[PDB]
Amino acid sequence: SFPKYEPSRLASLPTTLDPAEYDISSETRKAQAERLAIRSRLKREYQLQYNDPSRRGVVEDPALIRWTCARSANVYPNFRPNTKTSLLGALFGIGPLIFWYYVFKTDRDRKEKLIQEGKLDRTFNISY
Amino acid sequence: GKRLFIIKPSGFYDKRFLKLLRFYILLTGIPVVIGITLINVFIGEAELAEIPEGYVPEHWEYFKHPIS
Amino acid sequence: GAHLARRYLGDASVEPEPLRMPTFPPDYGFPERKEREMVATQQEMNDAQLVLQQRDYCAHYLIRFLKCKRDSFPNFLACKHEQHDWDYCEHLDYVKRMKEFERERRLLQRKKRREQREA
Amino acid sequence: SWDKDVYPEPPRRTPAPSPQTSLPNPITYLTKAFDLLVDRPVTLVREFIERQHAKNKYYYYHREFRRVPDITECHEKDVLCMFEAEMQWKRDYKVDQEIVNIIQERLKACQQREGESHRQNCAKELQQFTQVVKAYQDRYHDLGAHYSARKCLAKQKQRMLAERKATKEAA
Amino acid sequence: MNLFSSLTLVTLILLTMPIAAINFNTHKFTNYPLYVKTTISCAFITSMIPTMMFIH
Amino acid sequence: AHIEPRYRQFPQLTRSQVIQAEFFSATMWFWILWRFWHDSDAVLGHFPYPDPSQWTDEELGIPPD
Amino acid sequence: SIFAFTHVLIPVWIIHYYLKYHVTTKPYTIVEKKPRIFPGDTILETGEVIPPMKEFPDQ
Amino acid sequence: HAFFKAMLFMCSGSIIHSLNDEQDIRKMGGLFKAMPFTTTALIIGSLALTGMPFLTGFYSKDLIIESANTSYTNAWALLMTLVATSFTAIYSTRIIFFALLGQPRFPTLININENNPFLINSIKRLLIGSLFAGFIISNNIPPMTIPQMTMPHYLKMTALTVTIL
Amino acid sequence: SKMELPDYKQWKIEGTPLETVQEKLAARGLRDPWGRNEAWRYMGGFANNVSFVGALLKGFKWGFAAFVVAVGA
Amino acid sequence: FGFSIVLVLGSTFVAYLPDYRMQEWARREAERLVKYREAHGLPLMESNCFDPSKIQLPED
Amino acid sequence: GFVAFMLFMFWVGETYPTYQPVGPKQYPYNNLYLERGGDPNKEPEPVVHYEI
Amino acid sequence: FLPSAAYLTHQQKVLQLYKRALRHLESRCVHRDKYRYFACLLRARFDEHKNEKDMVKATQLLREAEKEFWHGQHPQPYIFPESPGGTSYERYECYKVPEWCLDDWHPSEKAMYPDYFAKREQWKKLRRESWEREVKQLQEETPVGGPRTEALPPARKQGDLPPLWWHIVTRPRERP
Amino acid sequence: DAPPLTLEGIKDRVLYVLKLYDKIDPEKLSVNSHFMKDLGLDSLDQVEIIMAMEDEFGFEIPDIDAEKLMCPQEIVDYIADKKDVYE
Amino acid sequence: MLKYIIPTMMLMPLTWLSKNSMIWINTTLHSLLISLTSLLLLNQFGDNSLNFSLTFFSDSLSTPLLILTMWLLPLMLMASQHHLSKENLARKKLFISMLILLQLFLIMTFTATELIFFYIMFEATLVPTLIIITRWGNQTERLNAGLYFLFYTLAGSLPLLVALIYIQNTMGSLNFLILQYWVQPMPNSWSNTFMWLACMMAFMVKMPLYGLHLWLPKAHVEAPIAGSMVLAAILLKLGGYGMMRITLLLNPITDFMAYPFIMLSLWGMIMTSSICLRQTDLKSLIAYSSVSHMALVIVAILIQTPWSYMGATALMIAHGLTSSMLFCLANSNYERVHSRTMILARGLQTLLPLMAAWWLLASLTNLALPPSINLIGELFVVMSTFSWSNITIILMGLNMVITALYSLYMLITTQRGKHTHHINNILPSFTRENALMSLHMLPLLLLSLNPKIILGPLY
C-alpha cells in the first residue's frame, strides 16, 4: 500500500520503519544497555563536575577540544597522495580557473578587436 | 507579591561608561560648537572681491572661512 | 474576443494582424473623405505640460478638464461634465479606430477572396 | 552671487491664480500664517547677522597664474621644465573636469525645468554637451591612471597621425 | 517655494530627534512610546500639507 | 472595571465596542449602497459598447469589384 | 504646549533659515518643474492672456 | 494595498495575541460574536479583498485587470490572473469561515477580551481609511495614462464574474 | 484566585451533532463515546452562528433606512 | 586626551580646512573660463589641447 | 515538470499574443515628430491619416 | 533513546504510535465532532485485533500499521505553541537570564534589593553546607562502579537535601 | 496577558474534566486514587486521559513521563512543574 | 615628518626611564599627542604632493595610511594589557619599546624617498613583529607561524632588491619624482617579464594573494592582539601601498602578463569566502575575511583606472579599521572564555548587552554598511572591473552574497540563540573594551561623513 519511503542522504529515514527495532535479540538489548551505561557514566561525571558551588571556571570539554584539534591541526598528518585524490584536486582547482581564463580570453579579444574597429558604444563612456 | 523578582543581568557598568562618554564629549561638545557659532555669527566669513591693480596678497586671504 | 481564435485556427490572409496594420493605401473604396480637424494648436499643446502618448485628438477637452480642476481645487467633485465629455470624445476616437480595423478586415476579405478565388 | 550669463535660466513664467472657488482656500490662510510666523523671525535673525557681517571686512582672493611655456618646448630630460609644464597641464585637466561638470549640471537643470517636454528647449544645451563630451572622450579618456602629461601627448600625436592617414587615404 | 521645500525637509528631519534623544538620555524614560507616537503624528500633520499644495 | 474571566461560557460584552462594530459594518453598507447608485454604473462605465464596427459592407469605402 | 511648540517650530525655523540664504547662494540648487499654463490663463508677473482655442462643435 | 493589509495584519494579530498565541487555523473556528469589533474588522478586510464592487480595492485591482485584458498581453498571463483571482477569492472565503463562523475550538480558562482604547482607535481609523481614502486618492490625480474605458461584453464585468464564481 | 466553579452534570448532552454521533456509534456497535466534552462548545450564547451570506448582511440594520433617507434627501 | 581633545578637535579640523586639489578654486576658475569662452563666441573646450601648428609629426 | 510546463506555456504565449479589434493610434503630427527624437530642420516628412 | 531504560517496550511503541496517530488525526480533521467520530473509529480499529497473545504476528501487523500510518500522516501537524518546532519554543528567552549571575552587580544595586539578596545568601550557605560529605558519599559509595542509569536516589536515610539538587531546583521560571 | 494559576483551582479543573469522562464514577473520585489499582481502566484509555489533559492545557507531556503519571496527584504535580505557579 | 620621526625616538626612552605604574599613562598620553601632531599633517594640495626633503615626501596615498598607523598605535598600546600585567616590568618595557620601534619603521616605510629606502624599511617592518608574536604567541605553534611568516616574506621579497638595483643602474636614480618623469615603456621581452614578475610577486606575497596565503591564518590565530592588528592592517595595506607606488613603471606589458594574477585573485577570493563559511576557531574568520578583501584590493590594483585606485585605497583604510576592531572583539571573547573556538561561547545577548551593539556594528562594517567606506571601496572596484570586463560582475556579486553570509554567521554563532549556562565565569563588560570600541568606530563614522580625505592621489 506504500512505496516503503526510499531514503537519501538529504531526506532522512524516520524512526518508525527502521525495521531494526523489531527482532531485538538479547545481544542488541545488551548493546543498548551498554550504550545507556556509557551515557549514564558521562552524565554522572558531568553532573559531578558541574554542580560544585566552589567551582568558578568553565567545564573544559575534551570532546570539543578533540574535535577542534582534529579538524584544524590533525589534517596534514595523515596524508598520502593518491592518484584519485590528486586528479580530483587538479580538477577542483585548475578546471574553473582555466574555464574563467578562457572566457576572459574570449570577452577581452572581442572587446579589444571591436574597439580597434572603433565601433564601440562610446557616444560618451567617461567613467572608465 | 504581584511583581516578581525580575532578573536583569547588570546595568551599572554600561550606564557608567555611557555617562562618562556623554560627559567627556559634553565637556568639549558645548564650547567648540559655541565657539564656531560665535565665529560664524560675529566675525563673519569673507567677501568676494578680487586682487586690486598691481598688488600682492599673502598665502592666506584666499579662503572664505576665517578659521581656515 | 474569439476572433483571436479565428485567426489562430483559420487562415492568416483575411484575418487582419496587429503591428502591421497599414496594408492598403487609403481612400481605396471611398472618394475623398478626410478632414483631420486638429484645432489643438500645437504650441499651446506644448505650453500646457501634458504627457507624451496624450498629445492626441480630443486634447482641448482635456485642457478644459485640467483648467477647471486647477481653478476649482477645493471643489473636489467639480469636473465631471467635462470629464465625461473627454470620455465621450475618446470613446468616439476608439470607435473610429475599431471602424478602421474592420474596414481593413472587410477590404482584404472581400477583395482578396473574390479575386483570389476567381483569379 | 552667480553670473546668469554663465548659469542660464529661462525667466519666471508665473501663472496668475483664478478662482472660481468658494470654500475658500485653506492654503492661502496657511501660507499667510507661515509667512507671519516664520519669515519675520528669519528676517530679524538674518538682519542681525548681516549687520555683524557689516562690522568689518574679510576678503578671499582668486589665486592667479601665468603661463609657463609648454611641454613640447622641453627637451628629453629638462627636469626644471617638465615639472612646471606638467603641473600646468594637471591644472588644465582639473579645470576641464569642472567644465564637464558645469555642462552636465546645465543638462540636469534643463531636464527638470521642462518636466516631460524633454525634446523641447533642451536642443542647444544637449548639443553642446555632446560636443564637449566628444572632445573629452577623444582627448583625456582612454589613457590610464599613471598619466603625467606625456601619455596625453602621445595620444594627441597618434590621434592626429591617424586622422592624417585617414585623410591621405580618403583624398 | 520656501514653504514647500521647508515642510518636506522637516518631514524628513522630525524623524531624527528620538534616536539621538535616547542616546543622549543617560536617565530612565517612561513615555518614550508616547513620544514616538506623537512625533509620528506630527510628521503626518506636516506631510498632509505638501500633497494638497501639489495637486493644487 | 476591566474584563473578568469565566469558565466555558459565552463571554461578556460591553455595549460600546459592539455598537462601534455594528456602526462600522453599517457605514460600510451605507457607503456601498450610496456608492452603487450615485454615479456608477461600473459594469458599463457610462458607455454603451456599440456593435462591431457597423456590420456593413459597401460602406466606409470598399470596392465591390 | 511648549513641548509641541518647540518640536514643531524649531526645526522648521532652522531649515527655513538654511533653505533660503546659503543654499540659494549656491546657484544650481533646488529647482522646480515649471507650472503649467493653459490657453485661458494669464501671466501674473508680466501679464498677457493666451488667445484661447477656436470653435468646438459637434461635441 | 498598504492601508488594506496594514489593517488586516493588525486585526488578525489582535485576535492571536488576545487568544494565547495559538495563531493556527487548526483550533481557531468559532469567533463570530466573540468580540465583535475585530470580527467586523476582519470581514471588512477580507470582503474588501478582490474588490466587492465598488470600494477602494475595486479601483486598483479592477483597473489592473481591465488594462490587462485590454492590451497586447501574453494570452497566458491573463489566464493566470483569471485563475489566481478566483483562488484569492476562495481563500478569502476560507479564512473568514475558519476564523469566525464555526464552532469555538480553543481550550477553557478563556482570555476573551479586546478592550483597549489604543487598539479600537487604531482599527477604527484604519477601517475608516479603508472606506474612503482609496476613492479620495483615485479621484484627484491627473490621469497620466490613456484610460481604455471602452470594453466589450465579458471584459469589464469579468472581475465581478471571477469573484462571484 | 477564585473561579466559583460552573459545575458538572449541567449538559445532559442534548447537542444534536453529538446525538448523531451517538446514533452512528451505537449502530456501528461501540456504545462508548468520550462524554459531554463539546457541549460548552455547543450551546450557551452558542448553538447558532450567522450564515456566511449573513456576514455580508450584518450591516443593513442601520444601512437600508439611512440609505433610503439619504436618497430621499 | 582621546576624545575631548583629539576626536572633536580633529573633527572640526577636518570639517573645514583649505580645499584639497584646489577644489573651490577649480570651481571659480572653471566659471571664469567658461564665461570667457562663451563671451568670445568660440565653443568651450576647444579640443586638441596642444597646438597642432606647434607639432612636428614624423611622416610616413 | 511543473517548471517545464509553466515555461512551455509561457513560450506558447510568447508566440500567441492577445490582440483586439483596434487599429493603431493615429498620432497627429508625423507620429509626435519634434517631440520624438527631434531634428528641427533636418527632415520634415509628408504623412497624414485619412478619416475613415 | 531515553534516560532510565534502553528499549521502550513493545506496548510502549504501540502507545507512542497511538498518541502520534491521535495527534495527526487531530491535525487532519477539523470540526471536532467528526473528529470524535473517527477517534472512536480508530479506538475500535485498535480493538479489532488487540487481545492476541502472539509475538511475531503482533510485530508484523504493527509494522504494516506503521507503513499504512506513514502513508496516512498529515504533513503539517497542529503542534501546540509550546512544542519544539512550534510557535513559542523559548519565546520569552529574552528574559531568561540565568541564576548564576546577579552576584556581579554593583553593591548600590544590592542596597536597592536587601531582602532578596540576604535570602539568596542563606540559600547559598544552604548550598555550600550540605554539599561535600553526605552528597558525595552517596554519589561515590551508593552506586555500583557502573552507574547504568541517569537517575539518582534521594538523600533517603537521615539528613540533608537529595543530591545534585542545585541547577535543577534553582532554575528560571520559563515565563517572566 | 498572563493570569496566574492556583493549586486548588487546577486540582478542581483536573477533577472536573475527569468527572466529565464516562467510565469512571463521580461517587468515589479521589485525587489520591490510582488507575490500575482500583479503577481498572485501560492504559490505552489512560493515555486518552493524558491527551485530554494536554488538549486542555496546550502542551505535550513526553513519553518517558507518559508511563508514570498513573494518578491525578502526579498529574497536577507535573503540570505544576511545567507552568510553575507556586505563590 | 622628521618632526614626526623624532618624537618617536623620544618616546622610546620614556618607557625606560618612567617608573613602576608610570610607564603606562605616559606612553598612552604621549602617543595620543603624536596622533594630534600628525593629524596636523594634511597640507596636501592640487598639483603635487607635499614634498619636504631629500629625506621626505608624502602623497595622499601615504597620508591616510600614516594617520591610520599613528592613530592605531595608542589604541593598541592600551589594548595589549590583561595578558602581560602578571609579567615582568622589564619584559613589559621591552614589549612596549618593541611596539614603538615598529611604529617608527612603519613611518620610515611610508615616507620613503627612493624605493631602496622603502625596501630597507620594508624588511625593517618585517623583523620586530616576529619577535612580538614569538615571545607572546600563547599557542604551541607560534614557532611554525613565525617561521612561515619570515620565510615567505623574505623569499618572496628577495628578488625585489635585485630588480630595484637593476632599475637603479638602468635609469638613473630611484626617487619616485624623477621615475614619474623618466618612465618609458619596456616592451615584451622575456627579461621584462621576469623583472615585472619579481617586483609584483614580492608584493603579491606581502598582500598575500591566494597562491601562498597559508602563513596568514596561523599568523593571526597564533599571535597576540597587538602583533595581529599591526600585521593585518598596517602590513597588508603597506604591501598594497608599495604595489601602488611601484606599478607606475612597467606599463606596456601588464596587458600581456596581468591576466593570470587577476584569475587567481578572483577564484581565490571566491574559494576563500567559501572556506571561511564553515570553519570554527572564530579568530581565523577575520583572517580569511582579510584574505578576501585583499584579493579584491589586488584586482583593484591590477586594473588601472583612477576609479579603481580610489576604491582600492578606500577598501584599504576601511578593512584596516574593521579588521582591527573585530580582532579586538575576538580578544574580548578570548578573555571571557579560554576557548578561541566558535561554537563554545554562545548566548551573550543577555550577558553584556552593549557588547551586542559593537558586534552588530562590526558585522555591519564587514557587511558593507550602506554609507560606510567599505561599501564605497567595494562599489567603485565593481564599477571599474565591470568597465574592464562585462562578465566579471558575477564573481563580484557572488563574493558579496557570501561575504554578507559569513559575516552574519560570525555574528549569530556567538551572540545569538542560547547561553550555555555552564560557563559562569565571565566578568561584566569592562570600560576598557567599550573605550577601545569607541576609539575604533567613531573615526570610521567621521570618515564616512566626509570621505574626500581617504580617496587617493587620483581624487
Curated annotation (Swiss-Prot), chain E:
The chain crosses the membrane at residues 4-24, 43-56. It is found in: Mitochondrion inner membrane. Signal peptide: none annotated. Core subunit of respiratory chain NADH dehydrogenase (Complex I) which is composed of 45 different subunits. Belongs to the complex I subunit 5 family. Core subunit of the mitochondrial membrane respiratory chain NADH dehydrogenase (Complex I) which catalyzes electron transfer from NADH through the respiratory chain, using ubiquinone as an electron acceptor. Essential for the catalytic activity and assembly of complex I. This is NADH-ubiquinone oxidoreductase chain 5. The gene is MT-ND5. The chain holds residues 1 to 56 of 606 of the full protein.
Curated annotation (Swiss-Prot), chain N:
It is an enzyme of class 7 (translocase). One of its GO terms (biological process) is electron transport coupled proton transport. It catalyses: a ubiquinone + NADH + 5 H(+)(in) = a ubiquinol + NAD(+) + 4 H(+)(out). It is a multi-pass membrane protein. It comes from the Eukaryota. InterPro entries: NADH4_N, NADH_Q_OxRdtase_chainM/4, NADH_UbQ_OxRdtase, ND/Mrp_TM. GO terms for cellular component: mitochondrial inner membrane; respiratory chain complex I. Core subunit of respiratory chain NADH dehydrogenase (Complex I) which is composed of 45 different subunits. This is NADH-ubiquinone oxidoreductase chain 4. It comes from Ovis aries. The lineage of its organism: Eukaryota, Metazoa, Chordata, Craniata, Vertebrata.
